[PDB]
Amino acid sequence: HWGYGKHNGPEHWHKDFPIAKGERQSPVDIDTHTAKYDPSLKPLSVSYDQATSLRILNNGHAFNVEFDDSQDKAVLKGGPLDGTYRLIQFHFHWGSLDGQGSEHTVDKKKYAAELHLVHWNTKYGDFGKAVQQPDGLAVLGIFLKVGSAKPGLQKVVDVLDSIKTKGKSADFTNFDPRGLLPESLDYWTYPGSLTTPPLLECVTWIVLKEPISVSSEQVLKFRKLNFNGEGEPEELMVDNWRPAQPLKNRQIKASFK
Ligand SMILES: NC(=O)[C@@H](CCC(=O)O)NC(=O)c1cccc(NCCOCCNC(=O)c2ccc(S(N)(=O)=O)cc2)c1C(=O)O
Numbered sequence: 169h170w171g172y173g174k175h176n177g178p179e180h181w182h183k184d185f186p187i188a189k190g191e192r193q194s195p196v197d198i199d200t201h202t203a204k205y206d207p208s209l210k211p212l213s214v215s216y217d218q219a220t221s222l223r224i225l226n227n228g229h230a231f232n233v234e235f236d237d238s239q240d241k242a243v244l245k246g247g248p249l250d251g252t253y254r255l256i257q258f259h260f261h262w263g264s265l266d267g268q269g270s271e272h273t274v275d276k277k278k279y280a281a282e283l284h285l286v287h288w289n290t291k292y293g294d295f296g297k298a299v300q301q302p303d304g305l306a307v308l309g310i311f312l313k314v315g316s317a318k319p320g321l322q323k324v325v326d327v328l329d330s331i332k333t334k335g336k337s338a339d340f341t342n343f344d345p346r347g348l349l350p351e352s353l354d355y356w357t358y359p360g361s362l363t364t365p366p367l368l369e370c371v372t373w374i375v376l377k378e379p380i381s382v383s384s385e386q387v388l389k390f391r392k393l394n395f396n397g398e399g400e401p402e403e404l405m406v407d408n409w410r411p412a413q414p415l416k417n418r419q420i421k422a423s424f425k
């Protein structure tokens with residue numbers, strides 16, 4: 169099945185998911201000079217005060233922290249969004265080295281990792297129906313650079329040795345995703361897709377300009393995870409990022425002058 173290796177990685181995905189060559193694929197390079205400030209964007213609102221994490225899971229491609237999305241608790245609204253989008257999970261993409269790992273790039277610059285907070289449009293009732301819609305999802309993307317430690321990440325790092333291999337999951341309650349956000353909510357936005365199969369074109373991307381800093385030790389712990397399941401040959405979970413895809417007929421808007 170699909171992955172990030174030579175024989176099943178991004179260059180192969182189109183054979184099983186032809187939308188991989190579609191008109192609104194993600195990620196993209198964000199050319200900051202060609203992005204245009206949009207005064208029509210409303211203030212972005214990230215309201216995570218009532219967020220309720222449930223579990224953390226190694227799915228063979230990344231690890232997901234999943235949330236209870238059965239009520240309006242952790243919502244994203246404003247900015248480019250119409251209505252309310254509810255947080256369902258977050259995960260990261262990262263590299264084998266600090267010089268790569270992000271999916272989006274900024275003037276071709278790659279960050280060491282990228283955090284994706286995944287939300288679904290509440291007008292569609294749940295995530296499964298939302299992924300049948302062109303405005304079903306909103307993903308808030310946050311770049312990670314290696315520097316000072318991010319205290320709010322440490323609870324995630326500390327649990328990773330319990331989910332080393334594909335299929336392992338662990339209870340993960342009371343995690344506050346607000347500890348993963350940078351100071352500024354300045355962002356770029358554009359219409360795109362999931363960055364992993366099935367690559368569905370449902371996403372309003374909101375990519376924050378300001379990276380968060382994590383320590384080398386924190387990202388090294390991400391790199392100890394495994395793509396493989398228990399009892400299979402060990403393949404370190406690294407470089408689980410899709411490269412930038414063609415912008416085609418899209419414009420990137422900036423929330424800031
Ligand atoms: N062999 C099959 O059956 C194919 C046929 C080919 C096709 O027609 O597609 N069909 C699917 O595979 C499929 C089709 C439609 C819906 C599906 N399930 C729900 C959508 O997938 C949810 C899992 N992913 C995420 O939630 C996610 C991914 C990336 C990001 S990110 N990095 O962008 O933030 C954020 C969230 C699936 C599926 O079973 O997967």
Ligand SMILES: [Zn+2]
Pocket residue numbers: 259260261284363
């Ligand atoms: Zn992602």
